[PDB]
From Swiss-Prot:
This is Nucleocapsid protein p7. The chain holds residues 378 to 432 of 500 of the full protein. It comes from Human immunodeficiency virus type 1 group M subtype B (isolate HXB2) (HIV-1). The lineage of its organism: Viruses, Riboviria, Pararnavirae, Artverviricota, Revtraviricetes. Methylated by host PRMT6, impairing its function by reducing RNA annealing and the initiation of reverse transcription. Encapsulates and protects viral dimeric unspliced genomic RNA (gRNA). Binds these RNAs through its zinc fingers. Acts as a nucleic acid chaperone which is involved in rearangement of nucleic acid secondary structure during gRNA retrotranscription. Also facilitates template switch leading to recombination. As part of the polyprotein, participates in gRNA dimerization, packaging, tRNA incorporation and virion assembly. Interacts with host NUP98.
Length: 55
């Protein structure tokens, strides 16, 4: 109990994805990066997203 975490005045918060203040990328609503725009899955660009295999 009372593990603690953060506690300081004049906190500085700035997102790494969109660059705006008051939040972090975990809390952000900007489009998800580092993943395909055509299927939504991680680890590739959508030109490597060739026809999908059966099951
Ligand atoms: Zn953001
Ligand atoms: Zn894809």
């Amino acid at each position: 109990m009372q593990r603690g975490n953060f506690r300081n005045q004049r906190k500085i918060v700035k997102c790494f994805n969109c660059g705006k203040e008051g939040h972090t990328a975990r809390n952000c609503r900007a489009p998800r990066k580092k993943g395909c725009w055509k299927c939504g899955k991680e680890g590739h660009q959508m030109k490597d997203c060739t026809e999908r295999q059966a099951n």
